Design a binder for this molecule. Structure first.
Ligand code: SAH
Lengths: 265, 265
């Protein structure tokens, strides 16, 4: 009579925590959603085999509209698990589901897993220096979202780094690349002209974090906008003011132009 | 010829990922550091028994000063694991160690795990709204740091939440409590008088993130400063203006007073 929110991690089925695995193994029913992110190193089949349970995949509408009708009813008389890529409560609105659980008389527990939000530490940028985060959303017909541009401006003025989650259209299997994100940003720059994101802007790209060989690249937009960063998922970062130690790591590990070491004071 | 930075996760020995545990098991030598943070829900012996191989604990000095003389030499002709609490490279000093591995001609890979930085999602506060992070350090002798106070001020001013890592004297296993942090912040407010932290300030406390039963509490400083939040570790968060869903989660899951729905939203 409980509901477990269990994260599966960054890239493959082994990114789940042992705590999460052992609990999932003992649940009666196991649901999951794969629309909030992309696990590029595994398959539903491999996950099912590891957990030894059939996984009932849910759509965004199934969750946001009918979570209390599909999952909670079973949780009232069984041990139920709801799996998600990465950490279940990071860059998702899943936290709200615990409220629905309580109002349904179902106790809930959360089991964390590696998240892209903290995994960006592998870029060498100090985690504490990351400011407000944003999501670069795909334009919808004539609707053109631009809120993320203002987030960068705000952080950059404070000397903070900006983490940019990239859009994903799971049902259409569309995963925004860092290239597409950069293209969108340059266009927003033309409209607002706030001098926030240009060809000379230094950016960092992290692709397939969690894999043994993720792509970690840093450089100016003009040089990376057409570079191949490999298969999705990707995240884009616009650094703020760099510490020499961050610059050194970017140069040594992310192949950044040695000129960034010569930080301006 | 390979060095693995493996995260142990949030609280106990089961917080490591399957990937990390399986890799650690196949390594010829296993090292660990417990100075950037601790693993309050377990012991060295329990971690060692789970992995099944002896673990050599390294001091801060061993790592910061002699990493290349203690760890790297073995990594040259052996597979070596270096375990760290949480997610590797979230702690600011970890990253530079990969550069040392590069110069020694040793390949290094990062195996991620949950970090408190991302685990705070369990407070119901949207991850994108967290601004710059800060650490509350104990004043000592002629040194009385107050930077964390300004971090809250600048974040709150922009409607962002502030995650406050609390001081930890790792070697002595002594943790700063959320209560002590609140007391210190009130003292800083008395000095700076910026109207940033007072008895009417809404705060959130997260203790023992990672365990199935962490303490998640929200309320005004006046009421929480003397409350018992249980055993370490404690994390303090000063939320910025709240989205109604964040407030409802705090009320329903963290026992926050109904007052926050009309004062902090
Ligand atoms: N392994 C990975 N590598 C690079 N980016 C990733 C990633 N996993 C997630 N992302 C990024 O984050 C977006 C999903 S947002 C959901 C994040 C998830 N709850 C977590 O905890 O990580 C993706 O569109 C992508 O931009």
């Amino acid at each position: 009579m409980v509901l477990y929110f269990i994260g599966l991690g960054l890239y493959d089925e082994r990114d789940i925590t042992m705590k999460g695995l052992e609990i999932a193994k003992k649940c009666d029913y196991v649901f999951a959603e794969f629309y909030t992110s992309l696990m590029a190193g595994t398959t539903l089949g491999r996950i099912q085999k590891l957990i030894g349970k059939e996984i009932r995949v849910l759509s965004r509408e199934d969750v946001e509209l009918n979570f209390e009708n599909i999952v909670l009813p079973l949780a009232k008389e069984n041990d139920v698990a709801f799996l998600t890529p990465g950490d279940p409560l990071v860059a998702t609105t899943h936290a709200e589901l615990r409220i629905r659980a309580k109002r349904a008389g179902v106790e809930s527990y959360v089991i964390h897993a590696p998240s892209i939000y903290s995994a960006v530490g592998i870029t060498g940028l100090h985690i504490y220096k990351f400011g407000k985060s944003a999501t670069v959303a795909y334009p919808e017909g004539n609707w053109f979202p631009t809120s993320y541009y203002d987030v960068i401006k705000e952080n950059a003025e404070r000397g903070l780094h900006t983490l940019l989650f990239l859009d994903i259209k799971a049902e259409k299997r569309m995963y925004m690349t860092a290239n597409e994100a950069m293209e969108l940003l340059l266009k927003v720059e033309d409209m607002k002209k706030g001098g926030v994101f240009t060809d000379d802007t230094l950016v960092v790209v992290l692709a397939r974090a969690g894999s043994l060989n993720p792509t970690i690249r840093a450089g100016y937009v003009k040089d990376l906008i057409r570079e191949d960063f490999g298969d999705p998922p990707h995240i884009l970062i616009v650094p703020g003011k760099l510490h020499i130690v961050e610059a050194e790591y970017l140069v040594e590990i992310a192949g950044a132009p040695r000129e960034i070491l010569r930080v301006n004071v």
